[PDB]
Each structure stands twice: as structure tokens, then as C-alpha cells.
Design a protein around this nucleic acid. Sequence first.
DNA 1: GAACCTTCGAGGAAG
DNA 2: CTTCCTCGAAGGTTC
Lengths: 50, 48, 313, 309, 312, 312, 312, 312
Amino acid sequence: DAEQEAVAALVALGYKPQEASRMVSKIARPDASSETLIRDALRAALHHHH
Amino acid sequence: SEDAEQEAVAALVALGYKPQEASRMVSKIARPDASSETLIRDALRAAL
Amino acid sequence: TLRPQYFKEYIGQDKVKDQLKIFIEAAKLRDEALDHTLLFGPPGLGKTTMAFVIANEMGVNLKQTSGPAIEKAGDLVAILNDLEPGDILFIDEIHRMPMAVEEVLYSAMEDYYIDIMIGAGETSRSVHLDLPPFTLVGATTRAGMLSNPLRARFGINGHMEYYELPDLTEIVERTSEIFEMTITPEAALELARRSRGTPRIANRLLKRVRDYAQIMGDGVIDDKIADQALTMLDVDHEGLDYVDQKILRTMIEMYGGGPVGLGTLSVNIAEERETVEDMYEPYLIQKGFIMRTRTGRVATAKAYEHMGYDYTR
Amino acid sequence: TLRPQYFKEYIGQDKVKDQLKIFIEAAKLRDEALDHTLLFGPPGLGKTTMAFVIANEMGVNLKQTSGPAIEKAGDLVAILNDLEPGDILFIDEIHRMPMAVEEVLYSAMEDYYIDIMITSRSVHLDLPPFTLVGATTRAGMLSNPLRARFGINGHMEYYELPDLTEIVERTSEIFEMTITPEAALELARRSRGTPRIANRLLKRVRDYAQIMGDGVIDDKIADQALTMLDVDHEGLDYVDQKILRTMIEMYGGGPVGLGTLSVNIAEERETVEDMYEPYLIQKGFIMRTRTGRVATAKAYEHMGYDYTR
Amino acid sequence: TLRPQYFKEYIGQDKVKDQLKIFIEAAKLRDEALDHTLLFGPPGLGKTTMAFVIANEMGVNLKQTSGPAIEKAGDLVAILNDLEPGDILFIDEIHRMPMAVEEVLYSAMEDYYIDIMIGAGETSRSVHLDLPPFTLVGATTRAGMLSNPLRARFGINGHMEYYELPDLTEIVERTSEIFEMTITPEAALELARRSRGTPRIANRLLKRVRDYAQIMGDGVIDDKIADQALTMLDVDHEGLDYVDQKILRTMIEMYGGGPVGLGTLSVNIAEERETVEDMYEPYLIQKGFIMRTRTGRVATAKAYEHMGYDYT
Amino acid sequence: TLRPQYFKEYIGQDKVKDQLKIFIEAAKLRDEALDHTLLFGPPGLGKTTMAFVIANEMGVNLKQTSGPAIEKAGDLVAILNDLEPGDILFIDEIHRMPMAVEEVLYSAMEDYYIDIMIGAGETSRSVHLDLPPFTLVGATTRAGMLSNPLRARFGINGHMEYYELPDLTEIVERTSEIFEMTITPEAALELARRSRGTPRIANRLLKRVRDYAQIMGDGVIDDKIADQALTMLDVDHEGLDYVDQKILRTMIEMYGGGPVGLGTLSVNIAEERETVEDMYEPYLIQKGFIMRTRTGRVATAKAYEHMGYDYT
Amino acid sequence: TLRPQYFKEYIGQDKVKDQLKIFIEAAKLRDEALDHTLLFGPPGLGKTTMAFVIANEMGVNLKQTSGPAIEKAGDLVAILNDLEPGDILFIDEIHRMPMAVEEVLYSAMEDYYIDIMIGAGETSRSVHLDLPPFTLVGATTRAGMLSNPLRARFGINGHMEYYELPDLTEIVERTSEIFEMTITPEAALELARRSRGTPRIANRLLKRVRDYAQIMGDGVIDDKIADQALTMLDVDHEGLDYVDQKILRTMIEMYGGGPVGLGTLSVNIAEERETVEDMYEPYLIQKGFIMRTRTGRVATAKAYEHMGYDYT
Amino acid sequence: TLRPQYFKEYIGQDKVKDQLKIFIEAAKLRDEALDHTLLFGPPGLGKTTMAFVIANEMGVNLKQTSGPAIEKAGDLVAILNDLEPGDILFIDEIHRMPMAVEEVLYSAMEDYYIDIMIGAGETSRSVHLDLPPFTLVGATTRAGMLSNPLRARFGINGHMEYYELPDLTEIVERTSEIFEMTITPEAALELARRSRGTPRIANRLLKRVRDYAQIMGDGVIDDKIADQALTMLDVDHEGLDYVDQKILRTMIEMYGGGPVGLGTLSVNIAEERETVEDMYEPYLIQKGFIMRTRTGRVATAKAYEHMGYDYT
DNA sequence: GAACCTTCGAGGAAG
DNA sequence: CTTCCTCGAAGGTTC
Ligand SMILES: Nc1ncnc2c1ncn2[C@@H]1O[C@H](COP(=O)(O)OP(=O)(O)O)[C@@H](O)[C@H]1O
Ligand SMILES: [Mg+2]
Ligand SMILES: [Mg+2]
């Protein structure tokens, strides 16, 4: 169920459903909470630079 | 060499080229052994 | 000459021409390109030709493009790779470049490289492309809309100005030869005085006077033909058309010099508001004959004396 | 036909007509195409008619389009691609073209080549020598770069009483109606200096003579017909006369404001300012002043009142 | 019916009606289309009605549209070319058309053709679309809003005037015959004199007097019934409304006739400046009760003798 | 509920009620729809309330919308397509519509049809929608902003007026019943004299006094309880507020009653020029505290005695 | 937390607290929502904090937004659908809401219903929405900039005034108690006088003084330490800001003391008109530094002697 | 040094630099992050360089972005989630980010968490995210263009100002060392005076003088050579640009000192009126050469002696 | 010389 | 991009 809530939050941030679905679907952790999922889907999509 | 072939297309996409067109542009280059820099240089030059 | 190759052949612009001469010579004494240059001024004075002469003095090739024609960052980078060491890039109307491209030009101008970034998260990477040393020459007409980050990179500023009778007259003479028309020096001065300082206007006058001199005359442009040719056309010795004279005459005769509103003046001369305000009124202000005030247009003392009227406060 | 075809038929416009003859004759001698020409001025003076005359004198085929009909650069390329050496392209209401289209045209005029992008792809053309002719009422609406490319500028003017008299006689023979010389001058004085207005009055008078007359125009039927239209010998309509009368009898000649005057005649404010006052100001019957508008001494003489300074 | 259909039934407008008869009769003799006509003037004087009369007298079918319904060149280009020879096209509120569309009519009215881009891409071409002979008819209240090149193309112009008491009486009696109501000639005049010169207002007063007579009376419009109904509506024998009477009274009793400014007068009657200047002052001026001067409004002698005060 | 549902409940507006009763009864006997009606006047007087009563008396469903909610011709056509025979359409704040929309009603009101363009653009033609009988009701605070052709189409006009103390007193009593409170007649008259003649203001004052009496009192509004609450709300016995009082004080203490210019007086009170002229000056003039003169405004004796100063 | 949460903690504003207490207590004996309340006054006086107190005394949820944050009329309808029964809606800067959006609130406040257009194109239709009981709290600086239709619908008005020296001093002692800081009574009195009578400024200064006294001193705020710390910052002896000095200096040296208009001054000082009109003039006037005249503002002698110029 | 790492290396801005030192070290004693800081002032004075120095003195990694680079709340949340306790986020042109982001920025700055409501209708939920401690540093050109409610969230203000002649000359000398150019203290002071306070203007003139000295001189920048080179570049001794001199010369010679309007003047010289008011007049007014009046601009007496004209 | 009233003109912001 | 409208100046009368 955390998948739907995660995508809904990403949708609430303005990301398109297609990207939000892919972003969350790429992550997998049965023990993750809806908060911890959001904090990982975004961290994987930002281009980190040094 | 597949890494550079993919890389050259991906960087070319960030420059505003379409995914399909970037794939074609790189596909037109023959030498596989050369680095992504050499590929993007030729890919850009050929499109001028 | 009309196709000049060196500063010795370029007519006018002595102020900017003397400044560039030093910067070019100092650059040649080192293994360095000329600093980035930005040219300002009203449209139609020869900025395109000036860029070409700069490249010949440096001894390098000139590439040409324009801001409206570029549309994606890849377009700019593609041209930059075609540049050989020391090449000059001329961008016309540089103030209309899209921001998406402007942000890439900053790194190229300052360090001569571009750093394309790709991937995301742990896949975040970049590729560094070296660029050969090059000089960017920009030309603009609305200097007040360039961003401060861009202006900070341009080192040399150049201001173009209208030509003057001693140097505008020489253009008329050289153009007369291009169509084998003999012109007396005293006549060329009468055309130059009426050309408003613009070469396109002097060329237009010479073409029309030529047609008159070969149909109503002996094929020679003498002082007598010039007098007649410039009388068939309405152009006054100050360069005022028939409509210009009518506007000044109406304000002085009927409104005592003003103030008078644009709408009230338009109905007297039978012209549209946009035609008086954009075609005729701009040159009258530059010449100093009228002024615009919160209550309407007013005619200056200079207009009264030119039109032959007694000025009283 | 109603539109003259040659300069021998084009009555009036001596200034513009004289210049074009000099420029047209010289171009023929050099075997070159005529310079780009712009015709502008008030409505109905003959701008469109002059464009057809220029083509006939040059002996060339005239291509025709209009500004409102051109919406995108793709349209203009198709048109220009049809030009042959020496062809003339005439664009009416040229002030309507979008700015995206004008930027293309002033390049083609100077260099005779086109290099434009129009799924997008580049298109390139190399045009033959040709002449562009433009006609417009709102000349000031064109951009300064475009106006600088035109080499000839013809500014039209109003006609004189002798010219309009000859124009009325010409039109009368096309309708095969007989008109006396002293009656033609009566229609001229009322035509406000414009050929289109002169032709309109003749048609209205013709309809009257066919019903209330014997199909002939004479110095008696004209007075009767003009009394039916209620057009004064100065060309003033019924409402024009009402305006002058109200100002002289209710405000002592002014000054009076635009709002006060409109409400007194039951007219709409914008109709008086745009439709009626322009002619009265040009004839010198009314003047605008910082405090209002006042009727001049000429108005008192025309209406028949005692003038007092 | 409520709208007349032929010149036999159209009362008044003698100047306009006489001219149209002559031009229409001449057009039939030559067997050709009528010239373009423009009808303009104040509201409710009969502009729309006359356009239908023209079509009936010419004996052709009328096509109708309006300026607000037309918004882009494709709309008008689709309406045009649907015309058959001799059709009449009537555009109400012609002043609402966008000026980009007005310029398409310049060629159509003068030379019966329009330039159209046809095809697409390389196949795009400019070709003449050639129209059959037709007559354009426009009606508007804001003629000064039309472009000068367009107004110059209309070959006939009709300016509508106000009606006189004899003509308005005959209109009231005519309308009183469509409704099944008996009306005495005295009451017909008593209404016409209050109608401000406009046929639409005369019809409105009759409908209101009808409702009263059939509820509070025997359903007959006699002199006794009419006076009672007009007292309920509170409309003076000069057509002055209740608020109009209050304005004149306030000027005579507080400012001694003026001069007084518009702002000062409006606040004393609890009306906003806009309603006074737009709804009430315009009629009082045209009838001579008020005079506008550089110092303010002034009450005329005619207003004193109407309200019963002394013109000292 | 607060809003009256029938003419038997509606208090005041005798002139408007008397006329509307006759027209509504006559319409029923003929079995026809009511004529278009325009309600106008100051804010808070009952314009919206009356529209619902008319619908209850006719016995039909009232469709509602507003001027600023309609933005293009398509919106209006959608609303009009949903009409059924005899429906009443109410448009509040009708002066806020754009002109390009108002000109579409011209045909709908007179002939019950609308010209529309339909089709995607490749193929399209003009067609007439034919509307069923309906009654349009409009309400506006400023009739001067409507165009002349639109006002001419309304067949019934209702100008609203301010209420007198006897009628406004009965409204205060009625409202107390819906709140289940008890009020002494002396208190009901005290509240009325402070309400500036507007029912909306009278209801607001009662609601505040009600809260006070039931919190620090015995739950009854007596003359002594009302004075305490109204003194805490800072409403004078003449209905003046503190800002209004500050103005009158300055005019007497610094200028001896005037004459004084508006700009000069504004400075001494730190008030904006137009705020004083548009918000406060109107009521002071209508009550007779201030008087305008050619050299400035002047305080009357009534303003002296109310403030306690000595007149000279 | 720094923000007070109950009326027993909220210092000052006694004239406002007394009224809100009575109205809130009355609204609890009846199970009803509180009436819509408008709070207005200078910025930073504590009106946002007051909204939280009301919500906590009612014992209901609070939701916050701002005028500019509602981009279009549709966004408001969507927001209202999330309000639960009894929820309080606070709208800051309510005077800068767009006209097309403001006219949406009128019907929602007065009858708890709102008419909206739903769907698009051929599916476009009108609908009405019904809202559960809610209380709107509006805050604005310009009490007179609100439109009369909106302003007349608020039931309670709250005018908030500046704090006095005894009240601000107690707030300083309160704030220094939540932090683990010690301040002597003399420094608290000095800090209050230096803080323009505004709680937000008084808190901001204390935070910065705390850092200075910890590093450059013994960790205790004393008059000797406070005066130094205030001089290391830009706070003048009279609490004038560094920008205030520019205004007073410019008026005397560049305009010769005035009179000068803020419009012409603003562009000569290179500042936003809105900032000089709202941020600087209200204090400089209310403290006698600036005087207002019909011709413009003038600097008083107190400003001449303070800045050190010659009172010519 | 030219690009310092610590305050001891930074040249100038002594007032701002002295304030930050106390706040930065005081924060370490408490073992907590630094309050949010706002830097403002003219462009090019060193605002970006200052942000790096703060990060080094704290011992924290600096993260950088800009107002235009953020378009949606997802962007900011992504950056803020990647912060580590004590990190500094720098946002250039904080006044230019979209208003929809600021709603999220409030809770981030004030609460360090965000609430993202989700669901609709019968459903209503939210996700709440917690963020580590961090310091925000924002830069703008003007303090008044920033959002009023946002401006209250910042606790420290830093007003940058123009550099003095001793600081500019030091910069010029250091830069000459980089180019290996020998410049005497006399010439160094000349370039400073004519650079009107901005370091990058001083750097531009130095580069141009080198090219002149290397060809027209003996490679050493003497005072005699420097003065000659500057006349070739057309830079006045007061630092008036070529365009700055053109404005003053025109007003005196063509308009007798004025008054003259901006529209007239900007058409005489080939410039855009929006450009003259933004890039050129500001410096001329601050130096007292131009003064604004109701009738237009006027040339002061100082300009007459500067340009070399006989004053009236 | 302070206070009202009417009139014209140039901007700009709201579709 | 165009139309509308509102803010500001000043001429003229009277105390
Ligand atoms: N105090 C200073 N010391 C050394 N160099 C400076 C100083 N102030 C400005 N500069 C120089 O001038 C330019 C300022 O750039 P930057 O700091 O980005 O300006 P800003 O951020 O104020 O727009 C840089 O080239 C910088 O090296
Ligand atoms: Mg034509
Ligand atoms: Mg009609």
C-alpha cells in the first residue's frame, strides 16, 4: 500500500504519474515506510554533483 | 565500447536532441573503439 | 572602398577605429586572441562590415550567425567545434538568444571549455570538452536588456555614430562610379547634407537623381541638375520632406507653437496618430525642432528661425 | 471601365504621376526592373488603381495577394516561388502581415535569396529580379527596417475642382447618361475632394432622374435631387449643419466641450469626434482650443449670422 | 404582427422611407442588385424592422447573422460563398466584428472577390474566389467605431430620427388591435405624449396599462382607467419619472436654480454620479429643462412653469 | 429563516410591492411568463431577497448565476440551453458582464433566439437556436454602467428606497423571534435609529447586542443593557462612528464652522482626500450635519448642539 | 514556544481581547460557529498570533493560506472543499486578492453556497456548491482598501494598536525567560524604548544582543552592555533604522526641509514607494518626526536637532 | 588575497565582516547552526564571495543554486532532503523564485518539516517529512522586492556598500602582480578614483591600460601614461562613461539646462527610455549632476562647471 | 489666494 | 496587442 501513498506524494510535488510510478517502482523494500520511500525515490532522481 | 555508444547518445540528449535522433546520429559513426568525446565531436560535426 | 579590407579603407568611425587598432596590435604581440568585443549603436551603420575588417587585421577567419536563428544548446556547441584557433565568431542581435543557450556560453567564454553533466544519483557524471581559443564579437541595439552575468564577460565596448559631411560625402562619390555616373564634388555635398547621416539614405537619393539626369538632362550630375532634381523631390536643404514642413507650419500658424495634442495635430494634416508619431516626429526631435511635454508638443526657437518666423515669448 | 488603365486616362495626381513616368522610363532604358514602390495616403484617392497602371506601363504580369490572406511564412514562400524575372508582386493592406513574416520579406528584398526553417526543415531559394509594390493607409505601422528597403515613396493628395469635374463627365459616359457641364460642377463641389464620393453621388442622382425625371440630367433635376439628399453647397450633411447651428445659437460660438455638445444633439460621443468633426476642421469651420472648440468667422458667413469678435 | 412587413404598414421615417422607395424601384427597372445600405441611429427607432422590410420589397430571401457571432476570418469566409445570386446579407451589431475581419470585406464589397490561401505546404496557393452579386446590409448604434475605409464603401446611408405625436398615436392604436383591447382616442394620445418619442416605450406603457385595466378594472382602456394607471406608475404628463422630478425640485429649492455642480447635486439625492449623468440628465437637456454651462447646471424658465414655482 | 419568503412577510418597499402584485396576478390569469424585470438601488436594501419572493409567487424553479461568473459567449449559451418553459433566470451583479456577452442577450430577450456558429471550422454554418418562454431578472447597484439598448429591453423597473423608522423597527422585532430572545419595544427603537436605514446593519447590531445580554445580564435586551453594548461597540446615538466624530470636532475647534476646503480639513485629521469624500461625507450631508457652499463646506447648528458646543 | 496560545498569555490589546472573549463565550453556550472577523492595523502587531488564540479557544482546527497563493477563482473552490465543519480559514493580505476571485467569496460567506462552472466545451454547465459551517478570519493593513461588498459582510471588526512601554517591557522579560538568558530590569526598559513599540522588532533585537553579550561580555545583558550592542547593530538612540537616517538626511539637505512629496522623494532616494509609504512614514509621523501638509510632508525641528543640522 | 578563504583574507566590507564574526563564533559556543542570513546590495560588490567565507569559518560544505533553477516544490524538497546537519544552502536571487515554492519554504525555514496533504472528497491524508538543521543564505539586489511574509523569516541582515579608495587601490595593486605589470602608487590611485567604487570596473580599466602601455609607452604604467590612456578610452576624471557625458552635454547645449522629459531626451540620443532610467541616471543623480523635477530633469550648477560651461 | 468646476492630454493594465 | 479608463495639469470664475 505504501507504493500508492508514495506515488501520491510525488504527484503532490508535481511529478507526472509516469515518472512517479517508475521512480517508486525502481525502489523496493518491504520494510520501508511511506516516509522512507519518498526520501529514496527523490534521492535517486537528483543529479548529485561535486 | 557499448558504454561510450550509450554515453554519447545520453549526453547528446541533454543537449536537446531527441532520443531517436541521438541514436541515429551516433549510429552514423563507424569507429567503436574511440571514446565518447570523439563520438560526440563527430556526431555534432556531421549534423552541421 | 565599398568592400574594405583594412582600417585604412574603412570610411568613418575614427573613434572606434583608433581604439581597436591598439587592442589588436597588443594582442598580436602575445600568444592570445583578442578580448571579447561588444558593439553598440543605432541600426544600419555598418556593424556587419566592421566585424569582417577586425578578422582580416587579426589574420583569422570569420564565422557568422544570429541570436534568433539559434534555438538549442547543441546548436551553439556544434558551431564552436568548427572554430579553428583564433577564429572570430560574430553573433548578430545577441540580445534575443534564448536563456537555455546563454547559460552554456558563460563557461565557454571564461575558460574555453564546456562540462556536460549526465545521469542521476550514483550515475551522476560529467564530460569535459576543450574548446580552441576564440574571440566572440557581439552586436546589439537594445543594450539595456543584456543580463549582468553576460555583460560582465565582455571586455571591450564600442559605440557607433552617425556619419558627418566630411566623410559622408566620400561615400556618394564612390557610389557614383559603381554605375559610371560623373558627379561634381559640389553636387555630392548637396546630396550628403540631405542624407540624415545614413548611407542607405544617400544611396537612395543618388539613384533617383541619376534617373532624372539621364531623362531630363545630358547624363551628367552638375550643380544645375542637382538643384532641379532636388526641387522635384520635396526634400528641403535640411532634409525635411513636404510633410515635415507642413507639421511645423501648422503648429506655428494655428497654435502659436503649442502645446498641442497628437490627436488635434493629426486631424489637421490628415494623418494617422501612428504615422506622425513614428515616421515624422522622431527626426524632428533628433534635429531639435520640437519637444514633448505633459500637455502636448511644443515648437522650439530653432524651428521658428528655420521656418522664417519671428519668435516671441 | 471604372478603373483607368493608362496614365493618359489617370486624371490628376500630377506630382506622383510625373515622378513615376521619369522612373519608369529610365528603368526601361537600362533593361532593369523598377525599384520597390510604396503607395500610401487617405482612403479612396486611387492607390489601388495606380498599382494596375504601373504594371501595364511596364508591360509585366501582376501577381496579387493581401496581408490578411498571409498567416505564416510557409504561405509567403509558396507565393515567392512562383515569381519569374521582372514579375510584379502587389500586396494590399501590407500593414497586416505578422512580424514573423516581415522579418523574412525585408531579407529577400535586399539579397534576392531566402534561407529559412519551416518535422521542421530548412528551405533555400534564389529569387529572380522582381519588384514589390505595397499599398497601405497605416504607413506608420510598418517597422523601420522594412520602410528603409523601399526606394520609391508615393504620397497621395486630394483633387481640385477642375479634375473632379472631368472625372464626373467620364463616369457619366460609361453609364451612357447625358449630363450638362454646369451640372457636373455641382456634384464636384459636394464630393469633398474624393473620386469615390463623386461616383456615389452620380449613381444616386441617376436613380432619381430615371424615376422622377426623363432619364436626363440637367441643371434643374440636379437641384431637385440634391434637395432630396439634403447636401449643402459646401458638402455639409444634415447633422453637420445641426452642429454649427447649435454652437452659434446656444453657446455664442463656444468654447464648448465634446461631452456637452454630443448630449445636446443626441449623438454618441465617438461618432461626432470620428465621423463629423474631421471635415469641419479641415475646411476651417471649427477650431480646437485648450478650453474647447469654437466656430470661426467662416461658419457665421456660411450659416448667415452676424459675426462678433 | 407586431413588426410591420411592408411600407404600407411602416409609419413615420418619411425621409428615409421616401429615399428607399426611389432606389428600390430604380434597381428593379435595371434588373440588378441593390447597393449596399447602412442603417444607424438611436436605440429602438426601427433599424432592425426596416431591414426585413427591404428584403420583402425586393422579393428575395434574407440571410441573418450578427457581429458577435463572427470571430475569425474562417467564419466569414464560410458564410460568404454560400450566397446565391441576389441574396441579401444582414449583419446586426456590425460594429463588433474584429478589425482583422473587416478588412476581408474590402475586396468583397468593391470587386466581388476574396483572396484565399488553398492547399497546404508546397501545395499552398492563392486563388481568387469569385462571389455572385449580393447586397450587404448593416445596422449599428456606434457608427463611429467602424473603420473609415469600410464606411466609404456603403452606397446608401440611413440616419433614423425621433417620431412626432401624430405618428406615435397611430402606432399605439395599431398595437392596441393586436392585443384584443378597446382603446379610446383620448387615452391613445395621453400615452403617446409620455413615450419620449420612441415606439418601443409606447408599446411598454400600453402593456403596463393593460395589466392594470384587466385586474383593477373592467378590461377597457378608458380615460378614467388610464389616468389612474399612470398615477400608479408615477409618470408625469411630460414623461418625467419620479427621480427626474426630484432633481428639478432640489435645484430650485436648495440652490435657487444654480449654477450647481454634478457632484454636489448627486450627493443630495443619494444617487451615484454615473446614474445621474447617464440615465436622467440626457433627456432633461434635450427637452430644455436644464442647461449646461462652465459654472454648472442651471434650471431654465420652462422648468419653473412646469413645477409651479416663480421665475424670479 | 431570516429571508422573507412571501409578500405577506416582506416589510416595506410599498411602491415596489404594489406594482409587482398587479403584474404577477395579470400574468397568471393570461397563463403567460412574467416580463423581464430590473431591480436597482443601494446595497443591502433587499434586491436579492425580492428575486426569491417573485419565484415563490410564480411557483417556478429559480436558476441562479452571477455577472463575474460568465466570461465568454459559450458559457451563456450553455446556461440558456438548460432553460425550460416558464423558468426564471436570475443574474446578480449584471453590470459586471463583458460587453461582448451583453450584446448576445439582445436577440434572446426580444425574439427568444440566438445566432451561433457551430462546427470544427472545416465545415461550419450559422444556425438559430430557438428558446422557450422565460423571464430574466437582473439586480444591480449601478444601472448607469449598463448599455442603453439593454436597459430599454427590461419591461419592469424597481428602484429600491431606504427604510423609515416604523418599518425598520418591525424588522428588528421579527429578527428577535428567530433568535428566541425577548426585546423591550424601547430597545428595538434605539437599535433602529442607529442602523442608518439599512436592514443588513440592523441585523448585525442585534446579533452583537444579543451575545452581550446573554453573557453579562439576564438574557433580556432592555434599554439599559443596549446602551452598555452600543457604548462598547462605539456607535453614537445618531449612528455616527469615531471617525465621523473626529471630522465634526476638527471643523469646529480649528475653523469655527468653516467655510473650509476639503484638502485643508483632511490634513488636520490625517485622512485621505477621497476616502473622506467617498466614504464619510455622503451620510453627514444626507442627515444635515454638513452643508456644501461655493467657498467650502459648513457645519450646521444641528452639528453644534449634537457636540455640545455653543452656536454663534 | 514564543507564540502565546491563550488569552491569559496574550499581553496588551485589551480593547480587542475584551470583545473577542465575550463573543467567543456566547458562541459556546449555543453550539454555533463564530462570526467572520476582520483584523486590521500596522504590520507586526500580532494579528496572526491572535488567530491561533481564537482557534485554540474555540477548540477547532486551523488552516492557513494567503491571498496571493490562490492563483485563480477555481483554486478557491477546491480549497473550500477541504474545510471540515467548524474549521477556521485565515486569509492574510486579503486586500490583494484578485477581483475575479474576491467576488467568489460574497455568496460563500453570506449563505454558505457558491455557483461555479464545471466541465468544458459542450460539457460546460453551471452548478452550485454548498459549504459546511466555517469561520473566515481576514487580516489586512489597509482597512479602507477593501471593497464595500466584501467589507460590509464581516460581522466583527478588530482594530489593533501599538504597545506601550509597560507592555513591551513585560514581553521582553517573557522572551528572555524562554531562552536561558538573564537580563536586568534597566536593560529591558532600554530595549523596549529602542524597538518602535513593535513586538517583532523587540524579539529580533534581543536575539542579536544575546550573542554579543555572550562573546564580548560576561553573558549578562546590562545597560552598559545593551547600549554598546545596540550601537554595534544599526539601531539609533531613538530606535531609528539606518534607512530612516537616509530619509531624514535627504529631506533636509537635498530639499531644504520640504515640503516634498513621497513620490518625488522615493525616486530621489532610490527606494520603493510602497516601502517608504508603509514602512517609514507611519512611525516618523506618529512620533512627530514628520508633519503632513496640503503641499506635502515637512520635517519637524526635533528631526533637525537630532540629525545635528541647523534649524534655519 | 583576491579570493579569500577566511575573514582575515577578505578586503573591505569591514562593517558586515565585523558583525558576522560575533554571530558565527557565538553559535559554536552553543553548538547549534547559524540563523538564516540575507545579503543585499548593488550587483558585483562580492555577495557570492562572502557566502563561501561564511561556510569556511563554520567548517561546512556549501551548496549552491538559484531562483530560476527551481520551478516546482519537488526541486526544493529534493535539495533540502540531500542536506546534512549544518549544511548551508545558498540561493541567488531569492526574490525571483516562483511564489508556489515560497509556501513550502516557510515551513522549511520555520519548522524544518513539510506537510504534504493528500486525498480528496471523503479522503484526506498527509505525509510529514522531517529535515535536519540548516542555514539558508539568500542574496538579492533590493530588500523591498522580497516577499513581505518571507522577509520576516530571516534573522540577520547584511547591507553591502561601495569600496573606499584605500581598498580599491589595494585591489588594483594585487591584480597588477598577476599580470606582472609594474604600476606606481600614483597611477594606482588614479584608476581607483575613476572606477566609481566597483572592483570589476577597476579590473577592466587595468587590462586596457596594459595594452596601451605595452605599445604606446615603455611597458610601465606611469602616472603620465595612465592619464593619457584614459583620455583615449574616453573616461572622464569623475568616471563618467561616454554615454554619461553625452547626456549632460545635450541638456546644456540643446535645452538650456532643461527642464526636459525622459521621452524627449531618450529620443534625441539613440537610446531606449527604459535603459536611460535604469543604467545611466542612477549614478548621475547620486553624484549630484542631475535633479528630478515636476517638469523633468534639470542640470545642476555643478554639471556646468564640470563640463566647462558658463553658468547662468 | 483659497476653493469649484469644467476640459484636455498622456499613460498603462486588463483582457 | 488593443481598448479602455483614471490620474494629473491648467484655464477661468468668484469670494
Ligand atoms: N573584496 C574583494 N576582494 C577581491 N576580489 C573581489 C572583491 N569583491 C569583488 N571582487 C571580484 O569582483 C568580482 C565579484 O564577483 P561576485 O563576487 O560574483 O560578484 P557578486 O556576487 O557581488 O555579483 C570577482 O571577479 C571577484 O574576484
Ligand atoms: Mg484599395
Ligand atoms: Mg435591433
